[PDB]
Structures are given as structure tokens and as C-alpha cells.
């Protein structure tokens, strides 16, 4: 109904509580296409709606914020999503992006290579991923949990996401991972968010809001992905670009969320409550240092 004036639709909580079996995803509006504003790329529209939705959550937004964006390149050789993130995030936010393939970016630093090669000394306040392999769209094969870059992302979250931070990780019917859904239960809240511009696709962003570093909920990710597909299969979403035309409240508010260094032993229930409310980030505030592992070979004979 009024969903068409939202930036998109989040998975309703009752769907998260089901125990569905995995089915094929068949979308009623498959092949519909939103009419984008003149000259606007799909990926600008999509990231704009994602950010509009993230504005409604309790993201921690510290000074000296650090954001890392995986899968930021395009077959066009530019980075539309990075450009939207930089628009959204407070001026001065440190933004790093990465992709397998070369591209030109507005990020403060860019690493080209497989995401598994990326290492960072520091922790992050927000992780965005649009990584995707269109080969997974094989409807003739069983739809099993995928490894690859999802294995990397799960480990990266657990090792390098600051307590209190958040993630938005792109999935689809076939591009998903059970452990990533399980990890959503380590946040104060989570959802699967579908942009209104791309609602004819099984794509969603799995959003984990305020990381706690421990299980708050035990989630079976195989069942949860089936629950997600059941929701999509039974709830057609009207394609809509309406939210793109009101950008007056787009910028993410610079909250100046507190950042503290704390050892595990000091994370009591009061700290956990602050983390859960978007009122605290736990990490160091040292320099941001990144690298990409490079395999060396000499093929001369």
C-alpha cells in the first residue's frame, strides 16, 4: 500500500519466526522495472534507498567513522554505490572500497583483488557488501548455502567489526550463506531489506544493526533463508522510485557516538545495553591501515 512511498520493505518479524522449507523463488513482478529518474543509474537508486532505510535504524555514528565497502566496482569501471555512500556518510568519514576488478572510485582508498586478500589493522563501524557472482543464478542446480566471499565476510565481521557497528550484506535467492544468517543473531537487531527500485529481484540486503560479539538469538540460517524466500514468494512488492525524489533528510546524522576501548572482561550488561541502543562503539581509535595480499609468480621459462 503505503509501502510504495518507503525506500523499500523489510522482512516482517513474523516471517522470521517461521520454520519453512526452502522453495524456488518465483516473483510475481519478475520482469517489472521501476522507472528511474532521468539519467540515474540503478545502482545509485538502489544504494540511495538502502541508505534511506539505514537512516531509520539505530546506527552508531562516531567521529572519525570508518566504513568499508566490498563489491564496489561495476562492469562500467566506476563505483556508483561508493559515491552514494560518501554522499550519505558524514563528511570526513574514512571510506575504503574493494572489488575483484579494477575501477575508479571516490573512496579514500581502493583495493583491487579478491576480497579474501584484504586485511585491515583496524576495526570498522559499518561494513557494506554488494559482492555477487551472477553464475549463482543457475535454476537447474540445487540451492545450497554458498561459501566463497561469504566465508570471508563472516570471518571479517567477527574479527574486524567494532562492537556496536552494523553491516548490510547483499544476498539473493541463490547467493546466500547460512552462517551469515546465524551471525545476524549476534546483533541487537537484524532484517532482510528489499529496495523498492529492485523489488522484482530476489536481492535483499541482510542488515545487522549494532553488533554484540556474541549470540543474542540462535538462528538456523538454512531455515532463515527459507523463511526469507517464503516471504518474497507470498508478498509481491510494488516497484517504486518514489523515495528517490525526496532527499532533504538523506544525510546520515553525525551523532558523535562514543568510542571506547574495552577488554572482553569489561563488557557488562550495561555496556551491552548501550551497544544495543546505538550509543556506543568499542574499538581503538588508531590509524586506519589496510592491505591486499598479492600472489607472485614468474611464468618465464
Amino acid at each position: 500500500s503505503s509501502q510504495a512511498w518507503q525506500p523499500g520493505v523489510a522482512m516482517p518479524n513474523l516471517y522470521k519466526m517461521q520454520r519453512m522449507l526452502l522453495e524456488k523463488c518465483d516473483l510475481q513482478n519478475y520482469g517489472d522495472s521501476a522507472t528511474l529518474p532521468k539519467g540515474i543509474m540503478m545502482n545509485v537508486a538502489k544504494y540511495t534507498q538502502l541508505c534511506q532505510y539505514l537512516n531509520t535504524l539505530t546506527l552508531a555514528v562516531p567521529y572519525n567513522m570508518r566504513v568499508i565497502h566490498f563489491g564496489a566496482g561495476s562492469d562500467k569501471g566506476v563505483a556508483p554505490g561508493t559515491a552514494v555512500l560518501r554522499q550519505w556518510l558524514p563528511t570526513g568519514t574514512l571510506l575504503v572500497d574493494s572489488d575483484l576488478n579494477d575501477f575508479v572510485s571516490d573512496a579514500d582508498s581502493t583495493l583491487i583483488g579478491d576480497c579474501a586478500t584484504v586485511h585491515t589493522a583496524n576495526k570498522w563501524d559499518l561494513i557494506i557488501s554488494d559482492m555477487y557472482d551472477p553464475k549463482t543464478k543457475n535454476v537447474t542446480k540445487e540451492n545450497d548455502s554458498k561459501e566463497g566471499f561469504f566465508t570471508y565476510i563472516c570471518g571479517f565481521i567477527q574479527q574486524k567489526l567494532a562492537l556496536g557497528g552494523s553491516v548490510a550484506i547483499k544476498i539473493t535467492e541463490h547467493s546466500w550463506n547460512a552462517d551469515l544468517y546465524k551471525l545476524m543473531g549476534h546483533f541487537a537487531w537484524w532484517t532482510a531489506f528489499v529496495t523498492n527500485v529492485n523489488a522484482s529481484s530476489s536481492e535483499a540486503f541482510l542488515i545487522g544493526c549494532n553488533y554484540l560479539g556474541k549470540p543474542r538469538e540462535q538462528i538456523d540460517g538454512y531455515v532463515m533463508h527459507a523463511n526469507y524466500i517464503f516471504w518474497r514468494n507470498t508478498n509481491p512488492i510494488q516497484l517504486s522510485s518514489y523515495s528517490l525524489f525526496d532527499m532533504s533528510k538523506f544525510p546520515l546524522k553525525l551523532r558523535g557516538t562514543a568510542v571506547m576501548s574495552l577488554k572482553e572482561g569489561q563488557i557488562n550488561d550495561m555496556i551491552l545495553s548501550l551497544l544495543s541502543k546505538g550509543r556506543l562503539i568499542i574499538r581503538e581509535n588508531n590509524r586506519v591501515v589496510i592491505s591486499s595480499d598479492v600472489l607472485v609468480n614468474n611464468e618465464n621459462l
Binding site: 562500467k76 569501471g77 563505483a79 552514494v84 560518501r86 554522499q87 571516490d106
Partner: protein
């Protein structure tokens, strides 16, 4: 002594009737901004479009060194405002035009410093 002259090549290509560089990244914005040329966030007014800066830079897009001792880029990491009448060719526009160092507007497309 030899240096590739990418700017001359693009200008000559355009005058020969070549298609401008595509896939410059146009941003959604209110179009109620200041209209200044190069800004930290989109600032298009009613008669401009705002673009991601790197995607509108000839040197960034062509994968070539910037014409500057330190190789710094004026556009990367910022947003560039392009008159709507010229938004078919943002790279050509940024290459051919100059920002007023006083008011931050494009000379000839917003700068009123030479008035009175």
C-alpha cells in the same frame, strides 16, 4: 620531453564528433544547493546536475597520471556540479572550464565576480 596530451586528444575527439565519455555517476539530490563547482557533498541547484567527482575526471577515467607534480586530483572524493545543458559530457565540461578561486562557482556558469 614527450608526454601524452590526453586533454587535447579528448577535445579533438569531441570536435571530430566523437561520443562523450559515458557512465559518469549522477547523484540524487534536492537541487536546492549552493551551485558551487566542486563540493564535499552534492550541491546542484535547479539548473545543474551533481556527479561523483572521480567519474567525471578525464585522468581518473582514462587511467592516466594527473597533470600535476604531485598527481593530485581535484575531483576524486568530491562532487562536481555540471550545468544541465552540459550534463551530456561532464568530463569535457570539467576539462574545458575553470573554477573561480574566490567564489567557488564555475567561471561563466555561476561566477558573478566580474559584475558591477
Amino acid at each position: 620531453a614527450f608526454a601524452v596530451d590526453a586533454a587535447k586528444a579528448y577535445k579533438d575527439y569531441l570536435a571530430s564528433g566523437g561520443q562523450p565519455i559515458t557512465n559518469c555517476v549522477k547523484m540524487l539530490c534536492t537541487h536546492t544547493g549552493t551551485g558551487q563547482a566542486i563540493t564535499v557533498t552534492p550541491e546542484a541547484n535547479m539548473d545543474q546536475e551533481s556527479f561523483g567527482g572521480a567519474s567525471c575526471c578525464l585522468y581518473c577515467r582514462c587511467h592516466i597520471d594527473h597533470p600535476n607534480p604531485k598527481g593530485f586530483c581535484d575531483l576524486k572524493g568530491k562532487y562536481v556540479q555540471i550545468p544541465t545543458t552540459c550534463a551530456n559530457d561532464p568530463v569535457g565540461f570539467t576539462l574545458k572550464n575553470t573554477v573561480c578561486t574566490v567564489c567557488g562557482m564555475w567561471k561563466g556558469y555561476g561566477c558573478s565576480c566580474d559584475q558591477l
